[PDB]
Nucleic acid binder design. Structure first.
Ligand code: GTP
Ligand code: MG
Lengths: 79, 843, 73, 224, 70
RNA sequence: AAGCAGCUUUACAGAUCAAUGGCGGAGGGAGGUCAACAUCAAGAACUGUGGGCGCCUAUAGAACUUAUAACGAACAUGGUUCUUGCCUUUUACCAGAACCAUCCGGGUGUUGUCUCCAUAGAAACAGGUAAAGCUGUCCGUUACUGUGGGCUUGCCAUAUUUUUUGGAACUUUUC
């Protein structure tokens, strides 16, 4: 399915996302999955409060993701 | 700027993925990749890159109607006139290509097409220091011969990942006409024989490290591929991944179930044969033999393909290709294994550490790059580089250095040049580039002037970062030149132009050694006949227009001995006594092999910087070496090992420790030359038996004194040592038919050494692989003799490996034996002849 | 099936999510889980707006779908 | 071979094409005292590598090198042996199950071998005319049957009489190839097509022999 | 399915886990699972009162996993 | 790869029997041992001319490249200028070069014919170029149904941890 391949193609670029938690994470993406797992670096979190933090490495569960936000050149990619 | 790009895009025959998304993918380091392609003669390299390019560009201007039907194989990445007229790849040329995959996630890839000829092995090394992983292409008919052995060996030594591509299977079925059961056994024999020489990793079609392709008919296979596009539709998806495992390896399925049992019941074939080989042979026999009306039904029924009657009218061959490229689509199976086989973290640190030394600091935050090849394109000359760190842009001032100046290790240390333009290599075209990103191999204009052969390139803003950075070691070429020719210009007034051209040669040709003598004659050292023939054509045509005179093919020799010393200073306060010893063959072979001593391998002497307890531990451990001598080992040479043995070493160790550097410079100076022919010395050990120094030494011991005295003592020490003259020997790889074996034998008997090392039945083909050894002075016109005498059946490759120098049977100095002039000398004295002949050139 | 879903392709859509937020933009890619990809997106949390760009939503998160405008040339 | 005035033992010999061999000089470069003498340096070497074993080559074309040395096998004696057959010249060299319905897609035919596939794979390697099923028409004197015979080796057994003929035919072939014409005429329409026109001619059919006899009487009457 | 995650590089190293209910744990990484169930040794709570325990954390719960020292 | 449904058509009974919309048609097919007239290796890019709306197409000239890929898997003669034998010279020649020609052939386009063959017709009208449904009108089925064909389709069927058989439900305070 194409909605997963687009993700794999944004590996390397910087990504923004939203979780069921309520917070948004922003950073370079290293690995993804068909599940929608993620592996990122130099993340800059921002919760409901506005509280910023730093997280060196992160793994996720896709189930917990609401939606992603992806770079602009990834609209000319082949489907 | 923008305008120049507007004229340059019109030359480029555009693309299906255009340039924007591929140029966009360059930022992420884990994205893209770099890959070289290597193999023997005519393995399908350049035609495989042909496949990737025709899957790349939508409209190529060069196609005749003939190449599109594929009667004559199209050659992309052979640009030059020599490459087309000769018929073989000469200079390496790459293609920057965005490739999708089965995962639909595309990546940029930098392909490097290396020549397959042995005389050009040097440039393959230039692709080794560049590529991250390498595709070794094997002929299913030829199988693997010694050159593949030494390719997977050099490959695994240089810390690059290996993909194996078994090519020309259509030559397996069509030419040799093997049944399925025998063809599977043949591929399996090739796989076992490629696995035998690899240590620590076993391959198998199941592990996706082996790829079955035919570049002519233009198809490519991995088992995951041919399973995914077809058998994945038919049966559920959870069973396919374990089905792939249940494909290879003796598994047999009777009806709907598989049992490893021998073949019990009746109708019996293996799974790989049943699901792959048999349907392939069916594709061929049906495409050729069957009525074209019948085939449409099998295409629609099985593969869901429909064809126009125009496709049904070609000829047997171009219709076969149209059917194969039709059924098996654009090749993402190759890109799958190329994507999987290279993981940057595990290999990369070992690969960069193998050159820049393992110590690393100042990560990222610096421009760090390595210049390998000076390429001749339509304009001028261009610099092929790999980008290890940092960002390049047009007009950037860049620091440059040379590999030898790096061997030597503030102000006066920095030559610098601006980067005028950076292209991506498009083979026949070049793509203009604003900015160069980490990991990608790019072309640059303006950097060539500061270097010859390899170069180290960096930009550093910090002092500590200047201190921590470590330069690239000089690129180790795969073969030593060894093939000697004396050029003069036909009209001496034209000497300067030739000079210029020669320098240009040394730039574009990494394996050439240009030496200027006393008389102005220009000695050129090159790998073989063909290589130096390309040298001479580019020298008379492209570069220098001067008509030139060429001498008779010759070779470089060496000096040795087989077993006391009195010496006197020009101001007789010094005395030198140095013994001369032959060396063990095991020690010689361990020195000639360049290694870090990893595993159980004997340590190379270049690691002497490690604790001499370790070096002495290696010497004593392997050779039973003398403990005192092992600890008294001083250094190695440009050449053999140097040791200090005497009591005054104990008497005045410090006074000698002041002269050690004098001895070590004047010594390299001495053995770099020689007493007989002024040629380097091979396999000769020295020990310093005595040293006598002036009294109170008032500026008395000096380099101008000790150095030429040590030099003379080494020379006459070699004279009293019963010296010998040394000749290099090619190892010969011949492929002939069985009934032609005696002829080859006589050929060997006719030349000089007549030494055949091995004779090997080539399994599955009517070919003999004959390994042998030939003197290089006799190697002239040997290939043509073999080819003519055998009426076009068979072939010869002369490769220089193990770098062995065999003794010349002639007496070393005997004025008595030599025979009249213009007569080839007798077998009894060939040493006196060669020595004298070089002597009257030296003076 | 999914015959209707292909018909929506390349139309500006109004997608309500479980959070209440509503995304808007064209539809480039579609899934069996109802993963939607959307181009030039804009949330309307509610007198509010934000510019995101390319957004990939999950199936869990999506509630309803509705065409805003016809397919663009 | 023509340009360098060095010929193959079985190839044709031409004139020099470059007049002056006259220059002969000893020198510190040339001197036989400084040159190591081994190998004959046969002329085949000068032709095989024209920029190396030959000094100052001129008007020389870059030769082809090293084709793969094809292995192809063929059986001329018994055709009863199958198309895929191992030839004597060749060196000796409980978990998961799915329904029985599926098979190899293309295997619904029992045997891949056909009566026409052996001759077909035998036509896959054939000279130009036969390997192509579609072509264009040529005049009878255009097709050259014996051209292939004198491009080959005389081998051994033949007498010198026919070998010299091989060399002569080769010489004529090389001259015919070396100097082409490539004429382009849009202007001329056939002397016969424009000739038949108007009154003085009429067109019919005749036996070939009768046409010959007519033409003979015409020639005789005209010379008389 | 069942992509065995890339936790080989964390084995036998200290960690700073976070779990559901804003509760977090330090420990040496012993072993991991398909579903990301974890084995930690020398487990210490972070309430700020740090209690030594000696533990198998469930996969579902896990939010993230960090490294204390580079 | 069967069936169902959807799509395309189809022999069609059809809604309309209007305005529509689609696909084709407003100059047939094949073959001339038929002729006339033009050209004619291919490609990027420079200059000039003409047409249509800076762009596109055609023609001419120059330079570069390809293996001069083979208008011809053929190859024959002559002239001039040079170099080789000639002693004679004429006829002819001997055997290499270069520049020219001539001759036997080929394909492509277009025009006018000839033979054999095809059934709707709307092949009807008016505009022009070097060309044509090129354009405008126009008409054949027809744009929405059911029977009959093909597929480009459903992707092929999972309630127990990463999406479609729910951790939801509910309350209260702040602005
Ligand atoms: N029969 C057969 N020959 C093949 C096939 N693929 C490649 N070849 C051989 O490869 C030759 C042409 O391939 P090239 O790519 O030009 O040669 P190459 O492999 O680049 O050789 P190098 O330039 O020396 O590396 C042909 O002469 C073929 O004999 C194949 O599928 N079948
Ligand atoms: Mg090649």
């Amino acid at each position: 399915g194409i909605p997963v391949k687009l993700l794999n193609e944004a590996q390397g670029h910087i990504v923004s996302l939203e979780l069921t938690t309520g917070a948004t994470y922003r950073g370079k993406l290293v690995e993804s999955e068909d599940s929608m797992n993620v592996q990122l670096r130099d993340v800059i979190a921002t919760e409901p409060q506005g509280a910023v933090t730093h997280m060196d490495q992160i793994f996720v569960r896709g189930s917990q993701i609401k939606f992603i936000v992806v770079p602009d050149l990834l609209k000319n990619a082949p489907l | 700027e923008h305008t120049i790009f507007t004229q340059l895009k019109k030359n480029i025959p555009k693309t299906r993925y255009n340039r924007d998304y591929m140029l966009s993918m360059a930022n992420i380091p884990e994205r893209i990749i770099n890959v070289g392609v290597i193999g023997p003669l005519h393995s399908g390299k350049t035609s495989l890159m042909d496949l990737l390019v025709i899957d790349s560009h939508k409209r190529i201007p060069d196609m005749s109607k003939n190449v599109e039907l594929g009667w004559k194989p199209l050659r992309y990445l052979d640009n030059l006139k020599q490459e087309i007229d000769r018929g073989l790849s000469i200079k390496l040329n790459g293609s920057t290509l965005l490739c999708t995959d089965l995962e639909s996630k595309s990546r940029m890839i930098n392909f490097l097409d290396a020549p397959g000829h042995v005389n050009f092995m040097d440039e393959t090394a230039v692709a080794l220091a560049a590529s991250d992983l390498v595709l070794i292409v094997i002929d299913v008919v030829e199988g693997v011969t010694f050159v593949v052995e030494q390719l997977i060996k050099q490959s695994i030594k240089n810390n690059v990942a290996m993909c194996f591509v078994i090519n020309k299977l259509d030559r397996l079925i069509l030419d040799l006409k093997l049944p399925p059961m025998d063809a599977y056994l043949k591929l399996n024999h090739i796989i076992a024989n490629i696995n035998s020489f690899t240590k620590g990793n076993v391959f198998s079609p199941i592990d996706n490290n082996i790829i079955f392709a035919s570049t002519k008919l233009g198809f490519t296979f991995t088992i995951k591929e041919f399973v995914s596009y077809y058998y994945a539709h038919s049966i559920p998806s959870s069973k396919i991944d374990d089905f792939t495992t249940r494909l290879w390896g003796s598994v047999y399925y009777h009806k709907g179930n598989f049992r490893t049992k021998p073949f019990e019941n009746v109708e019996k074939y293996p799974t790989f044969v049943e699901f792959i080989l048999i349907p392939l042979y069916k594709i061929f026999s049906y495409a050729l033999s069957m009525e074209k009306d019948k085939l449409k039904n099998l295409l629609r029924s099985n593969f869901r393909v429909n064809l126009s009657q125009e496709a049904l009218q070609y000829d047997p061959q171009p219709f076969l290709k149209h059917v194969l490229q039709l059924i098996f689509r654009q090749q993402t199976g190759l890109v799958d294994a190329i994507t999987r086989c290279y993981q940057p973290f595990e290999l990369f640190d070992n690969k960069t550490a193998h050159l820049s030394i393992p110590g690393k600091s100042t990560p990222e935050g610096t421009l760090w790059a390595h210049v390998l090849k000076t390429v001749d394109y339509g304009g001028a000359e261009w610099s092929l580089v790999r980008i290890y760190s940092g960002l390049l842009k047009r007009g950037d001032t860049v620091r440059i250095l040379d590999t030898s100046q790096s061997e030597s290790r503030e102000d006066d240390e920095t030559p610098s040049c601006e980067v005028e333009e950076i292209g991506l290599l498009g083979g026949r075209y070049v793509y203009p580039v604003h900015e160069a990103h980490k990991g990608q191999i790019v072309l640059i204009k303006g950097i060539s002037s500061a270097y010859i052969k390899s170069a180290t390139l960096y930009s550093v803003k910090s002092k500590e970062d200047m201190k921590q950075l470590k330069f690239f070691k000089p690129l180790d070429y795969i073969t030593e030149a060894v093939f000697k020719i004396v050029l003069q210009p036909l009209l001496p007034r034209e000497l300067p132009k030739l000079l210029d051209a020669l320098n240009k040669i040394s730039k574009y040709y990494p394996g050439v050694i240009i030496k200027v003598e006393e008389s102005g004659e220009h000695v050129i050292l090159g790998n073989g006949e063909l290589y130096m023939d390309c040298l001479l054509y580019d020298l008379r045509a492209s570069y220098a227009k001067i008509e030139i005179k060429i001498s008779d093919p010759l070779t470089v020799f060496s000096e040795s001995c087989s077993n006391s010393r009195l010496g006197e200073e020009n101001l007789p306060g010094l005395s030198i006594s140095v013994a001369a010893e032959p060396m063990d063959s095991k020690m010689i072979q361990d020195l000639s092999r360049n290694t870090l001593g990893k595993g159980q391998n004997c340590l190379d002497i270049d690691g002497i910087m490690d604790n001499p307890r370790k070096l002495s531990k290696i010497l004593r451990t392997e050779y039973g070496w003398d403990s005192l001598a092992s600890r008294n080992v001083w250094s190695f040479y440009n050449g053999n090992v140097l040791i200090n043995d005497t009591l005054p070493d104990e008497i005045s160790p410090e006074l000698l420790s002041k002269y050690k550097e004098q001895i070590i410079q004047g010594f390299y100076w001495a053995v770099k030359e020689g007493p007989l022919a002024e040629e380097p010395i091979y396999g000769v050990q020295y020990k310093l038996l005595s040293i006598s120094v002036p009294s109170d030494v008032n500026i008395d011991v000096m380099k101008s004194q000790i150095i030429p005295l040590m030099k003379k003592a080494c020379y006459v020490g070699l004279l009293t040592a019963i010296p010998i003259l040394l000749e290099p020997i090619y190892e010969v790889d011949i492929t002939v038919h069985a009934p032609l074996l005696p002829i080859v034998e006589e050929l060997m008997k006719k030349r000089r050494g007549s030494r055949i090392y091995k004779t090997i039945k080539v399994a599955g083909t009517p070919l003999l692989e004959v390994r042998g050894q030939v003197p290089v002075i006799e190697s002239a016109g040997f290939e043509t003799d073999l080819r003519l005498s055998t009426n076009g059946l068979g072939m010869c490759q002369l490769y220089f490996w193990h770098k062995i120098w065999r003794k010349v049977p002639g007496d070393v100095l005997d004025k008595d034996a030599f025979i009249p002039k213009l007569k080839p000398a007798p077998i009894n004295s060939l040493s006196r002849d060669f020595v004298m002949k070089t002597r009257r050139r030296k003076g | 099936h999914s015959s209707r879903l292909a018909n929506l392709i390349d139309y500006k859509l109004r997608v309500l999510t479980q959070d209440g937020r509503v995304y808007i933009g064209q539809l480039m890619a579609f899934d069996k889980h109802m993963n939607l990809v959307l181009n030039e997106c804009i949330e309307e949390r509610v007198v509010e707006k934000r510019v995101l760009g390319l957004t990939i939503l999950r199936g869990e998160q999506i509630l309803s779908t509705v065409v805003e405008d016809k397919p663009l040339l | 071979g023509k340009a360098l005035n060095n010929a193959i033992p079985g190839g044709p010999k031409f004139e020099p094409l470059y007049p002056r061999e006259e220059e002969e000089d000893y020198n510190e470069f040339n001197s036989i005292d400084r040159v190591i003498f081994r190998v004959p340096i046969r002329s085949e070497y000068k032709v095989a590598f024209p920029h190396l074993y030959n000094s100052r080559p001129r008007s020389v074309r870059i030769p082809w090198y090293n084709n793969p040395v094809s292995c192809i096998i063929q059986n001329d004696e018994e055709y009863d042996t199958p198309a895929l057959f191992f030839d004597p010249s060749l060196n000796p060299i409980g978990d998961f199950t799915l329904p029985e319905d599926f098979a190899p897609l293309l295997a619904e035919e029992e045997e891949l071998i056909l009566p026409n596939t052996k001759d077909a794979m035998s036509l896959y390697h054939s000279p130009f005319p036969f390997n192509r099923t579609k072509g264009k028409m040529v005049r009878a004197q255009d097709v050259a049957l014996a051209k292939k015979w004198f491009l080959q080796h005389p081998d051994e057994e033949y007498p010198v009489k026919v070998k010299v003929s091989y060399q002569k035919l080769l010489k004529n072939y090389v001259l015919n190839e070396l100097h082409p014409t490539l004429p382009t005429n849009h202007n001329k329409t056939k002397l016969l097509k424009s000739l038949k026109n108007t009154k003085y001619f009429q067109q019919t059919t005749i036996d070939w022999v009768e046409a010959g006899l007519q033409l003979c009487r015409q020639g005789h009457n005209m010379l008389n | 399915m069942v992509s065995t995650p890339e936790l080989k590089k964390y084995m036998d190293k200290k960690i700073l886990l976070n779990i559901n209910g804003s509760r977090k744990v330090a420990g040496i990484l012993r072993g991991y699972d398909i579903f990301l169930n974890v084995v930690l040794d020398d487990a210490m709570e972070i309430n700020a009162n740090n209690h030594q325990l000696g533990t198998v954390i469930r996969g579902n719960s896990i939010i993230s996993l960090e490294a204390l020292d580079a």
